[PDB]
Amino acid sequence: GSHMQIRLPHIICDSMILQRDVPLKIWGWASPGEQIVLQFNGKKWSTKTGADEKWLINLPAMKAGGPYTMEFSGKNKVVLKDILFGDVWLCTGQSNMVHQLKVHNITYAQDIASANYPQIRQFWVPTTTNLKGPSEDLPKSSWKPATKEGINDFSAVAYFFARKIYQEQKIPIGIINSSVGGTTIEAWTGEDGLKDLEEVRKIIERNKDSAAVNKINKLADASQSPPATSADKGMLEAIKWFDLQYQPKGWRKFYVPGYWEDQGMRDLDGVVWFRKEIEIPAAMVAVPAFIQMGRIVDADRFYINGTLIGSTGYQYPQRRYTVPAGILKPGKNILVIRVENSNGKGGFVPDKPYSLQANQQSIDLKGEWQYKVGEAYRPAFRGGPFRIQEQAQPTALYNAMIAPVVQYGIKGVLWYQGESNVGNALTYKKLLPALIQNWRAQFKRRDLPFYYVQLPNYGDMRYQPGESAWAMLREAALETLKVPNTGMAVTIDLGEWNDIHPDDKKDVGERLALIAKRLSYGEKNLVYSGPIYKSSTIEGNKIIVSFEHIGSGLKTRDGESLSQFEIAGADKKFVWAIAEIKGNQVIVHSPQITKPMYVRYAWADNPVNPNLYNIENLPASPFRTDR
Amino acid sequence: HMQIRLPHIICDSMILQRDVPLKIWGWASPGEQIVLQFNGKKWSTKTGADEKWLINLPAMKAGGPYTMEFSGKNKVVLKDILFGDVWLCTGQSNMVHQLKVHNITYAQDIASANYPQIRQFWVPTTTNLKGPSEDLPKSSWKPATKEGINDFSAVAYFFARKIYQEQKIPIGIINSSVGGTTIEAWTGEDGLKDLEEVRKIIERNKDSAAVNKINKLADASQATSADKGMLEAIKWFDLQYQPKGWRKFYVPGYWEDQGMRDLDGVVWFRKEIEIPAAMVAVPAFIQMGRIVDADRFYINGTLIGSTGYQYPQRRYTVPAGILKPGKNILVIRVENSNGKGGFVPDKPYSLQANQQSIDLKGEWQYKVGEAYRPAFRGGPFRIQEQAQPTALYNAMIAPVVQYGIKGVLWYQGESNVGNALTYKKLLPALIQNWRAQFKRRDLPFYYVQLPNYGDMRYQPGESAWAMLREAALETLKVPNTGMAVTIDLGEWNDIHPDDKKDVGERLALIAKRLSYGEKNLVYSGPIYKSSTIEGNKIIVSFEHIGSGLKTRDGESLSQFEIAGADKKFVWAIAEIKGNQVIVHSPQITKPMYVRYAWADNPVNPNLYNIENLPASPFRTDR
Ligand SMILES: [Mg+2]
Ligand SMILES: [Mg+2]
């Protein structure tokens, strides 16, 4: 890593949006003693590279605007063009901030097609880890605009946030998108924020020891069983089951949607094939076709008339296959789906779209299919030992994808994470404030705005009160409002029972934009939160609940009675309660609870009808009054 | 008794057993002389002080009709009496199942049935905890013609029709069967005396005070409906109801699998469908599969059908005038008290009218009417007489021990999978008990090995159903018995499979060989005899190979497993070599045990003989 000439950090490149209204640092590397001259804003700026091969130029604050160029000269020449000054938002978290407009392009087709915001730009950070400590540079990437060429790669949440802020504030908006699916808050926290967790602390130190890491990976590889040979009859028989000439023998009836565990196939992991013959009118031939096959657990190959038209390797993507003209023929067509399933309930997720579309016509793909098992996997032990997976390691993502930008000026942080911490949801009460204060320390921005997303509803619904790990995670977010300069978007009405990646990203980004408009952009009278539990008092057989953020008043979303309220006495055995808005408060009681002491609202993974709002249509946070 | 009284089985249209000395018995006042006029001759006996009389008649050849005129203080005349073969057809619900509940598959058999000399005497469900009853409940002998065919047990009818077509004598069916019942309830006291825990129950149940003390304990020691769909001012089937708060559901399926966790209670389902004019002003037929547990089905606010429990197939006939042109509203209220509520998959869901059909699978809307709170389900409960040892034997078998019969058909066991190991002893004990009580130590007893049922598995495993089938297989040691294999006739999703015809006709093969002397008839599929170990092979020998072993589908032999000493079975290669199957697995270098079709529902049990009868499942480990 000897620098022989000027090198700029990857974030300092063409089209960047730099932070307006703050002293700016322009830093980089070069050969020792190399004389750097920067031509910028009608002036020349000079510095000498140190013996550490690093250089730094300090520039005075700039107001929003542009475009500018910068010309750097030393032993080489570097020219940067199309530089703007505006507000740079660091947008971070796991897969629901990762999720890009291109995978929500049915619902947001019109937003994608009309996006013409050349001064909203995203710098997307590839997934990167460093077990040794903070990295000095992000991976190579580019600043891409919210226009035709780059809109599809924007984080959907970040785009709808940025679009709302831009329309009202009218300054360039930069998005540093640093997000990785399936990751924990510990992986995103710098070492100093985790030092009080003794077991995590020891892992951090072990991971800096290459010998120790290599030992664990060796014992993982040594014990790693060899690759398994496929026993798939559908591929290994003389005629493959997608071959147009195959004659089904031994196939049974199946119904889409559904899981095969629920259709007569017990404890089965492996490969199951599905076959359906459908009649296609001539009007859907010789044109492109579009297949929506819901969501499949775990992986599928989809063949039409023997031709592979689509594949998805894992359970999370929605199946959306574009079929070229000429595959479908008039009359009888053979659809064959090979479903591979390595763990849990394989099959076709219900409450999802299953259809084939062409020429503004649609054919239903739900209903009767035929199935035959191609392979059943024999059970085996699967608990380890495992190699050290870097993105699961504490600090590893912070080090490589956050630490390199600490010198880059930023306006604030948007954070949407927690799905991967529901197993230590109680601990998250400490983990979230620790991350906030860690990033503030490392950025040297003790005032840095940090706005986060409370987890949405997800999972099976229940019709009796019960305990909930998701609810505990939502409480950790609620209680973190004690940290100065924070805000929380409630999303309990935006999720889906059957998907951890819900489609409605627009309302997430726009609810975060309300927080920013009030707290970062000084819109002092803007209602930016739904009702937030403040306090409660017991009066006889009733509990009276007071709230902050009532806007112009409390209401129910549907005009029906308040739902999802519970009440309990000293024994904490909760029952569904009667709840009624009176003035600015909610009165809770149950004829079954004589001496009530505690109230819960929307305390579940997926409350059926959380209908407490303010008149400004923002949902109340779930809460409990017991501790 | 001050007037002559005949047992309920001795009545008009009765089929009496041919070719045996016959007993005709009854009651009258003490000392009353009873005179029977029959077959051109008079018979006389005197009623004893115990109010009972008996007349012994000589054997009769098959035929009829005859009359019997009894004269005591009053006269009784019976007419339309036939002599033929009387089969006592017994067991639980798959013997109960009547042609009327299989009238889609057997519509034409029902329509064309014209056998006035095949007659069924159906016994209503009855129990007696005190001991053997002396009379059956009132019933009648009904013929297999249009007026009585629908009430025939389907298994018994298909047996009787096959026997009649070849043997050409009147066939009587004494149908004594009760759903959900155990073999112990069907066994007389003497057959259970060696099961000490059962014996103690038999004696307790004879003590009416002791039973009442338990029942009155239950009447003290053991919830209000909150169904919004019935209790809101506008009920959810009212045509004017406006759905608010309804969500999407997909039929077939269980709600546990569509987002409603741990939910017992009442869930309502709503679908609006477009009806073409050709389907209006004519009768309509709704098949709504099978529903767990109970349902009420409304169309345009009018209740068109209901079923109170999970077992019946839903088949509702809707009169002309309910359906209208255009938009029609279907509303189903489903109640579920235990287990997974909803709509059973792999069932028909459709509306038919005027040769057209509309799919009822697909997207419905749902809303929960009520969710039952958890509560203790263990009672205590009153003593249920149908569940008590001897209680069904006492009231539905014991009263006919003096009636001449040809043989017994038995189809039971589903309710004994919980003590399947004990069934190895219970089945021979019932056979020997009935033989003793009927004073027929040679009585033919032909039974049904349980069919396949339940979820399929793709790895070897244990199975209580398989143990129940082994009990049947091993009971073939008892003389004058025979077993029908049904491992290919059941259904994965129903304990009441539709194919009753093959059950009855496989039993008829057993009777034709063993009761009607058809010497060279192949009447059984291959039956495991023995096996030997030769290196890494186990060679299995079979009886009843007919004209040879084969596979049903022409593919490799399926469902064979092999294990070594540790009894860890793996799927094995199996090949037919004569009257033998050579079993081996490359993984098992020291094999000791073989299993075939050892599962609740073997995927492809394909070992047959050339005459198309299935081999019995078996294991060689014990
Ligand atoms: Mg599976
Ligand atoms: Mg249930």
Residue numbers in the entry:
A (entry chain A): 20 to 646
B (entry chain B): 22 to 243, 247 to 646
Q: What sentences appear in the manuscript?
A:
We therefore term this active site architecture a water-mediated catalytic triad.
Hel_I_48 and PpCE20_II from Pedobacter psychrotolerans, representing the full-length structures of the ancillary domain containing CE20 enzymes. Based on our SSN analyses both CE20 enzymes are categorised into cluster II associated with xylan breakdown and metabolism. For cluster II, the CE20 from Pedobacter psychrotolerans (PpCE20_II) is encoded next to xylan processing enzymes (GH10, GH43_1, GH67, GH115, CE15) and the Fl8CE20_II from Flavimarina sp. that is located in a PUL which is already elucidated on targeting glucuronoxylans (GH27, GH43_10, GH43_29, GH95, GH115, CE1, CE6, where Fl8CE20_II specifically shows activity towards acetylated xylans). Analysis of the surface electrostatics shows the ancillary domain is highly positively-charged, containing several Lys and Arg side chains (Fl8CE20_II: Arg313; Lys370; PpCE20_II: Arg314; Lys371) facing the active site of the SGNH hydrolase domain. In both crystal structures of Fl8CE20_II and PpCE20_II, representing the only structures of CE20 enzymes featuring the inserted ancillary domain solved so far, the Asp (Fl8CE20_II: Asp513; PpCE20_II: Asp518) carboxylate has a distance to the catalytic His Nδ of 4.0 Å which is too far away for a direct interaction. Accordingly, we propose the following catalytic mechanism for the CE20 enzymes with ancillary domain using this water-mediated catalytic triad: the His base (Fl8CE20_II: His515; PpCE20_II: His520) is coordinated by the active site water molecule, which is in turn coordinated by the Asp/Asn (Fl8CE20_II: Asp513; PpCE20_II: Asp518; called anchor residue as it forms interactions to the ancillary domain) and the main chain carbonyl group of the ancillary domain (Fl8CE20_II: Tyr334; PpCE20_II: Tyr335).
